[PDB]
């Protein structure tokens, strides 16, 4: 079809790079049944990198019936757990030997800086290694009760689970989503992003090596309308998880319901950042530029609601305003800057709208709004102020660099407008006080709260949403409890 | 109106009873919004007993808006755990010293045998004192790695949760139900069965004893699908219980879905029984009959489908058939009695049509089908056999006393064909062999498996189904895991 | 023998009480066989209260004979565990409905004032409650690998216990030895204090209407030296529970080693007070003092060694000895006063030699060291210091009403301080900053760390020394792990 | 001293070898302070291996100081724990690649065969990964109660630990000492076995590869009553682990006592093997044979006490007694034998002492009893029956190939037979019917118990004595249990 499985790219910092294509099913790469193809574009250059073939519903059912079996034929399952979790090691460290290339590649498909894509391969990485490390401690429960009765309690995988990739971070969507099922011995059916879906192949070519046997592990990409429905309407898939817009989200929970699907979903969301007159503006300073610019800003939880106290408010806009003069914004391929590019076009459309509705409805500018001159999706910061809070721009999701500063009084006021909102994912405190810190954190309702510091992750912690944005867990131990369902038997003893 | 808040009923075996009605809300039985009534009747007399007030739309918001101020206020929820403990003991200790009554009454609003009606007395006692055991153990988790960082994660109770009670045991359906809930500190708005709501209003006379303060426990009765609605739909409730039939399971789950609410749903479903020819057969009989026609076969793991080993076959159908001839039916208020009556005219017409459509499809009917006699919604107990596995009568719910005995050859084949369905909720094994028992135990897919035993509970084991049948547990404590959700917290230290 | 098993006693404060005596071996209370004797001694009257048959080592063999028996014959241990659950709630409550003359007693055997005697019976008995729920939630493990195999473990009660009540809390020492053992199935032959014997006999008189069936619960005192090797070095008992001075605690492990024997040990100790800058000077005022006098001093953790910050030095001395003038001493039977009765003219001859100690080494005499007066066994409160930290004073325990208080310059050298001791059991810390309290919290070494409180107790949380100091835990749930041992059965299933 | 760092060793299977000398310390080999040595010996050559330098207290002393330093400069403590667990992987990766010398060299120190010391080696191996896996899952306790307070429980490790290593299955003493230390932060002073020392040397030369820093572990060896002593009654170290025979063990414990050290213990001791009329009896057969004669006899819980149902009891012996004709016994190099060495002519006069008291006291012996010729130390393996149970002989411990077979009537009477003694360590069990299976396993008292089956040991499952023969657990996670103590911290909020 003139598209060989592999092809040549040429990377702007000195790398040699052998890029495969085709879909990912039983280990081996094949071309697309109806042979269909998409073009893949470079965010900062506005330019064609290369042609992927295009996955359809005849692809999606074949990955299907091969999970199937790889459950079915006991292969994954039979075993002494420690094998699962030793493959898994493997993988991790064939992975870490590459890192060179692969945060190169990374930087490619989205325009995340380089000085900051190296960090989540080693985020990744170690995640792997740590969770690799249950295979074989998840352990059923004894009840003794009685001289006449056995009762125990087993767990057990659910199934084929369906799983869907959002665009941010691809590395960590990836890693969240397989090593969960993996450990437990369930199967996956994996969406990859189709804007920016090269990453995601190219580390398949190692499942091989570690072991992992045919079947297990199917990726398929192609456009999400299609192949979504795909997935999601089969009736063998158990499981659903996606993270997105709450729109879509909504759609797809009454899709899935009808087949009583178990269904996980995360949604995007807002959230304050609370600053007192106790700590210091120099550190507080810091923390919230990171936590509005970092990643282009396209981040779930990158919240935009800044809540000075009133005795510094003064202090922290002069400053903060300053600050934002030297964040450097560029080239992706260049160790110096911090802010990169945009995804493409449409976001970058979205953002510039809601700029010009915040200056309409009432908003004060304080800076940016600008596009970053004419080629690359680049956007020059924004700061907005004394947007009362009934603005549209203070409910909506912007999912961009755009920040909102309002004033604070009194705590109790604080605590109580921090929480009026559907969207319950995160919160961040800046303070020295014990009592005010404690105080705050047992009362602000959000998925996590983050104390002296923002955007900072680990292994062992649990992330998701509070209420209306979400149901499940996506890291760390309690992550594993729902990918499995327990089993009970009780017995009668004669003597 | 002319309906006093109580009436006085006379009780067929020497008992003075006074009943109460209207809705329950903030500690208060009042009279409904819109002054509608409707009549109670006797299951085996075929006669009115009492007019109970009608609650509407209206009420529901009522209810609704006392359990949130009992969230909200903190009364319930800003206290050392141990005290809501203590008021749930004290409850069930109240209700023990009643015993009398509230079998009798139960049998009353039933039709079961009051010398099993007092079983399920003793067993809700235990179980309610039981949780109550848990108010003071719901513990956090502390994740400690570094020495900058903290980290912690906490559980908190959900919200408002709107629940659905059926009618097949009421006692246990409450319980299930509401302890789980106040446990944690949840609040509760019920919806009480519209064809037998006796039982269920009068014991929350007791609950203003116990202390449990007003707004967390609101009881409001109507028909089902105008109060269904009622609080599906509202904004405000946060989670969903139902049981009951498949498609009302279905449809729960699309209208629940579009607020993004959490739900969970028990269906019934059908269950093998397993006889092997190394069980002693006198044994296997009496379980087996147990299992078929217990509480008038209105049971939601009460499986009609025996397979019995060739070997055997000629023997266990001999017995089975002749055994059967010695089970009393009759009067609920008479110890001697096995079988009682049916719940109404509505599943009486049900079951019997599915006798006639046995009979036509070409089932032999061994015994039974008749109706029993004119009055009282009475059926003679039956067997079927010599059915083929395609036939309607054995994919089909039933939920009456009708049993099929069938073939079997070779245990690879029982376990292949047991599994066989969509209905997932109970297995049983009939054997002393160690090696079978254990390989089937774990090959066969059910929710629970019991071992030479059967219908046999206890407060400390879980319950429910494995894949269609259902999502989420009704008891022990692991039920408690969907009534709390985790937030974590994590902060830097400097030094 | 002219003692009759009860006698009428008169009590101060308008109360008749009915005084047992005997031992309490089989739930029935008998003379000792060697008819002995032994005169009990009212503290703040220095008079007669009554005779107590003294028993003997051939009492001992009997009640160990008997709590076998108990054991053995499956009474106790072939149940449903919610009734050994349900037994000890209810003794709770017959405790709670005799709290008057509970508290007066205590009062009269050790002369704490009866304004706190009623803090321990409130917390005794809400403790006892929740430690009954642990009946039915002490749960095995399975383990689940493999296909061919099976493996659980089940939790086992050691069986009979020996233990030791020491003489400060006579209420709680009871609870905390006795619920433990009872709710996993041990039975116990407990030594009570030969100073204050009395209401520990008293309660006991309850135990036959809980229903715990005899030979469970057994009572024997007499001298010290004597009954403890009578029980220590007896070939049955299985484990020794002991409290006391550090070279008793020696002793007695070297005796309980001979036999490998489980053996569990407090001991008394020292503890830090650090007072910050940031702290409010009243506050830590009122919490020091708590902290030094309460219970007259006869407490394990009322550590004596405080530090305070230089900047603040003059200020919380000036305000501390000043403050100290206000302690009210005197009769147990009046609410108003704070500080009451040493329990013996051993203790308070000890309590003076010291002081005339730190007079001659050289430390510092700032207030008190007076006998205060000539009847009853009262002690003037002290304070010390400008002590070196080579003095004996500071190295020794006083376990009286004795407090020293020293410079502190750095928080590093505070902790470095705080550390050099084999006497690991307490640390406190005043402050408001989170930085500073999260640090030291983490780098002072003790068994237990309070943060602006002290001697702060609540039933959820766990006691006992780090190092030196003691061998397990009192409290909570983590104390159960040392009255279980753990059995592992694994069989090979052949298909 | 004309002892170079290593020496060359020929392997009689075509291996080169080298092996190092001196001690292990911080890292680094090197010579005794005192300039002592002594002679290694192959136990089936009767000849000279080579010379080790032989330790002293002086050595001892240096060992604990660099214990000291490791723990206390933070560098092993003050980490991301997932660090501590992936330098243990890699050990244990660097091992697997070196199996073919090390499964030799075993075989050189101890004359296990060949053909199963290969077992122990991959054993080993997944153990280490496995524990691993614990490094980041030791989580402490979030304690939440009332809305005043804050309480959290932290685990930390307990210290500097003494341990010592027997000379039985020298690769698992190691593993078993070693990783439950490591894994938790402790620092390690190991005594080598010293007739058997060398294989425990030669793997420390990868440590300095795996990572682990210096001062974490050292490794010291000579003789037992002197190096024992410098260990356990050092000031320094916290806490004594110990295995071997009864009486050593008392002695040990009088002096660890002494210092109120925490103090483990495992005991040797006798098993029962219950033979029911229900089992097959050519599966019996070859298990009761590999319960006997595994590892020359010198294992803990080589039970020798063998119970036939009395209706099989003829053929069991006839089979059993034909069966011990095709033992092979010989070259430990030879694949093809089942039955290796003994130790030390120590333990060979010590066997036959007793084989001889056994035919004085009345013993009637069936087989065996003489020296297998005249060099090496080589047994015949002996079976002995119609053994009263008084005999000596039923007694005492063998550590040898020596089994008696004795008769069984009624169940009741050999779970009373098989519980009176002080040596609980493991039970067996064979038979088919699950009642019986059941009934025994939960009557007979055993650190562990195996059904249809024996010596079968996986990673996952724990093990130790009952009651007199030990205390604490020697695998899996509960073994964890004994390096770790609770730290607990509350804290009051104003607000
Ligand atoms: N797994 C088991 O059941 C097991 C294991 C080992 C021994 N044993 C028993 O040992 C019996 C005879 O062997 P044995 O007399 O040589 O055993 P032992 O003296 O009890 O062996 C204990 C081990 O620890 C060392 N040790 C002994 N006493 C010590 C002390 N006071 N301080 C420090 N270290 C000390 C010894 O090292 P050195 O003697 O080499 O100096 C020896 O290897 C056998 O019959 C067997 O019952 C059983």
Same mark, same amino acid.
């Given at each position: 079809?003139?598209?060989?499985?592999?092809?040549?790219?040429?990377?702007?910092?000195?790398?040699?790079?052998?890029?495969?294509?085709?879909?990912?099913?039983?280990?081996?790469?094949?071309?697309?049944?109806?042979?269909?193809?998409?073009?893949?574009?470079?965010?900062?250059?506005?330019?064609?990198?290369?042609?992927?073939?295009?996955?359809?519903?005849?692809?999606?059912?074949?990955?299907?019936?091969?999970?199937?079996?790889?459950?079915?034929?006991?292969?994954?399952?039979?075993?002494?757990?420690?094998?699962?979790?030793?493959?898994?090691?493997?993988?991790?460290?064939?992975?870490?030997?590459?890192?060179?290339?692969?945060?190169?590649?990374?930087?490619?498909?989205?325009?995340?800086?380089?000085?900051?894509?190296?960090?989540?391969?080693?985020?990744?990485?170690?995640?792997?290694?740590?969770?690799?490390?249950?295979?074989?401690?998840?352990?059923?429960?004894?009840?003794?009760?009685?001289?006449?009765?056995?009762?125990?309690?087993?767990?057990?995988?659910?199934?084929?689970?369906?799983?869907?990739?959002?665009?941010?971070?691809?590395?960590?969507?990836?890693?969240?989503?397989?090593?969960?099922?993996?450990?437990?011995?369930?199967?996956?059916?994996?969406?990859?992003?189709?804007?920016?879906?090269?990453?995601?192949?190219?580390?398949?070519?190692? +499942?091989?090596?570690?072991?992992?046997?045919?079947?297990?592990?199917?990726?398929?990409?192609?456009?999400?309308?299609?192949?979504?429905?795909?997935?999601?309407?089969?009736?063998?898939?158990?499981?659903?998880?996606?993270?997105?817009?709450?729109?879509?989200?909504?759609?797809?929970?009454?899709?899935?319901?009808?087949?009583?699907?178990?269904?996980?979903?995360?949604?995007?969301?807002? *959230?304050?950042?609370?600053?007192?007159?106790?700590?210091?503006?120099?550190?507080?300073?810091?923390?919230?530029?990171?936590? +509005?610019?970092?990643?282009?800003?396209?981040?779930?939880?990158?919240?935009?609601?800044?809540?000075?106290?009133?005795?510094?408010?003064?202090?922290?806009?002069?400053?903060?305003?300053?600050?934002?003069?030297?964040?450097?914004?560029?080239?992706?391929?260049?160790?110096?800057?911090?802010?990169?590019?945009?995804?493409?076009?449409?976001?970058?459309?979205?953002?510039?709208?809601?700029?010009?509705?915040?200056?309409?409805?009432?908003?004060?500018?304080?800076?940016?709004?600008?596009?970053?001159? *004419?080629?690359?999706?680049?956007?020059?910061?924004?700061?907005?102020?004394?947007?009362?809070?009934?603005?549209?721009?203070?409910?909506?999701?912007?999912?961009?660099?755009?920040?909102?500063?309002?004033?604070?009084?009194?705590?109790?006021?604080?605590?109580?407008?921090?929480?009026?909102?559907?969207?319950?994912?995160?919160?961040?405190?800046?303070?020295?006080?014990?009592?005010?810190?404690?105080?705050?954190?047992?009362?602000?309702?959000?998925?996590?709260?983050?104390?002296?510091?923002?955007?900072?992750?680990?292994?062992?912690?649990?992330?998701?949403?509070?209420?209306?944005?979400?149901?499940?867990?996506?890291?760390?131990?309690?992550?594993?409890?729902?990918?499995?369902?327990?089993?009970?038997?009780?017995?009668?003893?004669?003597?």
């Amino acid at each position: 079809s003139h598209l060989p499985m592999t092809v040549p790219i040429k990377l702007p910092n000195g790398l040699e790079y052998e890029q495969p294509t085709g879909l990912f099913i039983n280990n081996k790469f094949v071309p697309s049944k109806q042979n269909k193809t998409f073009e893949v574009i470079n965010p900062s250059t506005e330019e064609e990198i290369c042609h992927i073939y295009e996955g359809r519903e005849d692809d999606v059912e074949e990955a299907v019936q091969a999970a199937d079996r790889a459950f079915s034929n006991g292969s994954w399952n039979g075993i002494d757990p420690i094998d699962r979790g030793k493959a898994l090691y493997r993988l991790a460290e064939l992975i870490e030997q590459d890192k060179d290339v692969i945060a190169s590649i990374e930087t490619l498909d989205n325009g995340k800086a380089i000085s900051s894509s190296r960090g989540d391969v080693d985020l990744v990485i170690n995640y792997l290694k740590s969770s690799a490390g249950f295979a074989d401690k998840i352990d059923g429960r004894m009840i003794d009760t009685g001289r006449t009765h056995f009762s125990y309690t087993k767990r057990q995988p659910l199934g084929v689970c369906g799983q869907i990739i959002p665009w941010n971070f691809p590395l960590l969507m990836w890693a969240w989503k397989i090593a969960p099922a993996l450990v437990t011995g369930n199967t996956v059916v994996l969406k990859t992003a189709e804007s920016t879906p090269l990453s995601a192949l190219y580390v398949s070519k190692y +499942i091989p090596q570690a072991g992992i046997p045919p079947g297990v592990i199917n990726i398929v990409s192609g456009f999400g309308k299609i192949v979504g429905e795909a997935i999601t309407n089969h009736p063998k898939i158990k499981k659903v998880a996606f993270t997105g817009s709450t729109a879509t989200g909504r759609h797809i929970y009454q899709s899935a319901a009808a087949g009583l699907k178990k269904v996980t979903l995360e949604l995007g969301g807002k *959230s304050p950042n609370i600053v007192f007159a106790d700590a210091e503006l120099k550190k507080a300073v810091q923390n919230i530029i990171l936590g +509005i610019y970092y990643n282009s800003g396209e981040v779930c939880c990158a919240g935009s609601r800044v809540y000075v106290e009133e005795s510094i408010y003064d202090k922290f806009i002069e400053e903060f305003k300053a600050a934002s003069e030297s964040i450097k914004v560029g080239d992706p391929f260049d160790e110096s800057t911090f802010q990169g590019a945009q995804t493409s076009q449409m976001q970058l459309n979205k953002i510039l709208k809601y700029v010009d509705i915040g200056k309409n409805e009432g908003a004060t500018l304080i800076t940016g709004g600008e596009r970053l001159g *004419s080629k690359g999706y680049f956007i020059k910061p924004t700061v907005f102020g004394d947007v009362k809070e009934d603005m549209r721009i203070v409910k909506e999701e912007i999912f961009g660099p755009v920040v909102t500063v309002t004033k604070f009084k009194s705590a109790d006021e604080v605590i109580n407008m921090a929480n009026d909102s559907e969207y319950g994912l995160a919160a961040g405190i800046h303070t020295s006080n014990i009592n005010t810190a404690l105080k705050v954190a047992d009362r602000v309702n959000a998925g996590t709260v983050w104390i002296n510091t923002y955007n900072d992750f680990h292994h062992a912690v649990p992330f998701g949403g509070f209420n209306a944005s979400g149901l499940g867990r996506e890291m760390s131990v309690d992550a594993l409890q729902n990918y499995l369902q327990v089993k009970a038997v009780r017995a009668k003893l004669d003597e």
